[PDB]
Amino acid sequence: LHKEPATLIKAIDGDTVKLMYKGQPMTFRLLLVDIPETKHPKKGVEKYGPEASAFTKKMVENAKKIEVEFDKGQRTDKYGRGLAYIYADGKMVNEALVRQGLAKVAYVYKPNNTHEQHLRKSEAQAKKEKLNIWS
Secondary structure, eight states, X not given: OOOXXXXXXXXXXXXXXXXXXXXXXXXXXXXXXXXXXXXXXXTSSOTTHHHHHXXXXXXXXXXXOEEEEEOSSOSBOTTSOEEXXXXXXXXXXXXXXXXXXXOEEOXXXXXXXXXXXXXXXXXXXXXXXXXXXXX
C-alpha cells in the first residue's frame, strides 16, 4: 500500500472525515473501526460519541499533514465514501481511536483487512487498560 496526500475539509464524526483528495472533495469512512456516533435518530448521540468525534477532529485539524492510505480491495463503499486508513503527522487516526478505547475494531471484510491485527492488538490493550468504552 502507499500513503497519498490529502487536505482536510471538515471532520464530520468520529469515523467520517471530508477531505480534498486529488483535487476533489470526498467523504472518507475510516477503515476497520466503529466509533460511537453523534448522528443517528435511532439512538441520537451515543455514549463516547462526542468524545470520539472531538478526538478525530482535534487530531486532523492540528496536523501538519494528512495522508490517506487505501487498502487492497474496494476503495469506496455503497454510499460513495472512500474507504481508507487516515494518517495525521504519520500517526494512524484509526489506530489512535482504538488505542484510546474510543472505537472498536469493525467487522472485517477481506481483502480490506491489511492492518487488522495491529488494530486488534491496540484494542486488546485499551480493553486491558479499561479505557473509555471499556471502562
